[PDB]
Amino acid sequence: VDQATLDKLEAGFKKLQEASDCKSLLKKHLTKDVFDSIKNKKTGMGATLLDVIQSGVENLDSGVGIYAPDAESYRTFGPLFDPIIDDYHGGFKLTDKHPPKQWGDINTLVDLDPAGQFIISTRVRCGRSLQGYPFNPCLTAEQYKEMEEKVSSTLSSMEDELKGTYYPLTGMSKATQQQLIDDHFLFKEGDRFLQTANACRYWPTGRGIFHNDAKTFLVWVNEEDHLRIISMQKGGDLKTVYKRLVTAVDNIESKLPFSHDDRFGFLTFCPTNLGTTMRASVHIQLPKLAKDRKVLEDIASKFNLQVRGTRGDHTESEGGVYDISNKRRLGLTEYQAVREMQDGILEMIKMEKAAA
Ligand SMILES: Nc1ncnc2c1ncn2[C@@H]1O[C@H](COP(=O)(O)OP(=O)(O)O)[C@@H](O)[C@H]1O
Ligand SMILES: [Mg+2]
């Protein structure tokens, strides 16, 4: 690790301290003991501690603040990753290991809001990393193209309900892109947290989205993770949404080789997405409970749920529509993760109905 990097790190560490109002897990778990312990470490691909915390240093409003430039980083900088992972996922010891993939009994899931007065739409997604390829910050332009080719070709083999087309971002009209994003289908452009983590190099090369004509099954290619496999639709039929996702992931997995870790389960770029990599969500309106975003968030937190704005991560709620989902993804099965969202949303709906 060169002197320049050390300077930026010491300065980075410095800045975090003087940020008396910073509430990121990076700030919380990067003690000087932790800091001095790994600051001189470097991975087999050159990833350094700066590559890990840079996003969190530059964006103090980060909730977490770190990313893994490569798989090795999870262990090389474990002293920082471990406590942050334990904290975020609500309990994941140094000795714990993520359980085997378990979709569970799909028949036990239910309709989330029969009368349809609160829920607008339901979505469940997973993330996957391609074996043979490192995470965004270590990828070259040629690798982005390679991966895009490999994934788009595999998806052309999907059949029946999952049959669809791949739409490259490179060459996509600004109007179409803007629509696909506004419709909540496509990942947005230029996320400051991802950018400062050097995860958006060579954009839009190798980036794109596959989706069936109904746009109920979609696959993001090369955004935050190599792949994001999504199932979504209007309403609250979580059962159908989940089943579609399960069908799609089982199928894609028999065709592509994905990185899985004995301890961390499926590997992803952000520590928040490890394990099941599952984020089950609903776009929902809860007039009484969501009078004050803070009150809604405190309520959601007790059900292990997370609140986001209508356009996703770090956005505001628009028209009273909130994105509420299971916060935890590692240390519990796929079934358990979707159930935390189902259970908490069913109850919050009950609380809203009983609110004055
Ligand atoms: N339940 C949902 N219904 C419709 N759109 C949703 C829903 N949940 C998330 N989204 C959309 O997914 C997109 C990405 O959001 P983000 O918060 O970054 O989630 P992700 O975990 O998939 O990366 C946004 O356009 C967001 O509005
Ligand atoms: Mg996202």
102 lies in the same domain as 37:
no
Please name the amino acid found at residue 175.
Answer: A
Q: Which residues line ligand 1 (CB under 6 A)?
A: 121-123, 125, 184, 187, 228, 232, 279, 281-283, 308, 310-313, 323
CA distance to 47, 103, 258, per residue, from 100 (Å): 29, 10, 14
**Residue closest to 278 by CA, chosen among 252, 246, 310:** 246
CATH number of the structural domain spanning residue 111: 3.30.590.10
Round to whole Å and give the CA distance between 107 and 239: 7
Please name the amino acid found at residue 99.
Answer: P
88 lies in the same domain as 219:
no
121 lies in the same domain as 86:
no
Angle (nearest 5°) at CA 219 between 235 and 166 = 115
64 lies in the same domain as 172:
no
131 lies in the same domain as 26:
no
34 lies in the same domain as 58:
yes
Ligand 1, atom 5: closest residue by C-alpha: 184
**Residue closest to 204 by CA, chosen among 229, 238, 172, 178:** 172
Among residues 94, 113, 139, the one where a domain terminates is 94
Among residues 68, 94, 120, the one where a domain terminates is 94
Q: How many distinct structural domains can be found in the chain? A: 2
Q: Are 228 and 89 in contact (CB under 8 A)?
A: no
Q: Pairing relation of β-strands 305-308 and 265-266?
A: unpaired
Looking from the CA of residue 315, the nearest atom of ligand 1 is 17
76 lies in the same domain as 157:
no
Classified as helix, coil or strand, 140 is coil
Q: How far is the CA of 313 from the centre of ligand 1 (A)?
A: 8
53 lies in the same domain as 117:
no
The structure was resolved experimentally with X-ray
Cα-Cα-Cα-Cα torsion 108, 109, 115, 117, nearest 10 degrees, comes to 160
Tokens of 290: 């969501």
**Residue closest to 53 by CA, chosen among 29, 21, 87, 86:** 29
Among residues 77, 94, 111, the one where a domain terminates is 94
Round to whole Å and give the CA distance between 47 and 68: 9
Q: How far is the CA of 121 from the centre of ligand 1 (A)?
A: 10
108 lies in the same domain as 72:
no
80 lies in the same domain as 197:
no
Ligand 1, atom 15: closest residue by C-alpha: 312
Q: Are 143 and 80 in contact (CB under 8 A)?
A: no
Q: How far is the CA of 262 from the centre of ligand 1 (A)?
A: 28
Distance from first CA to last CA of the chain, Å, rounded? 59
CATH number of the structural domain spanning residue 1: 1.10.135.10
Ligand 1, atom 27: closest residue by C-alpha: 311
Which ligand has an atom closest to residue 186 CA? 1
112 lies in the same domain as 16:
no
Crossing angle for the helix pair 49-58 and 78-88, nearest 10 degrees? 50
CA distance to 64, 180, 312, per residue, from 54 (Å): 12, 30, 22
Full residue range of the structural domain in which residue 5 is found:
1-94
Classified as helix, coil or strand, 10 is helix
Q: Pairing relation of β-strands 227-234 and 217-221?
A: antiparallel
177 lies in the same domain as 253:
yes
Q: Resolution in A for the shown PDB structure?
A: 1.9
Q: How far is the CA of 173 from the centre of ligand 2 (A)?
A: 21
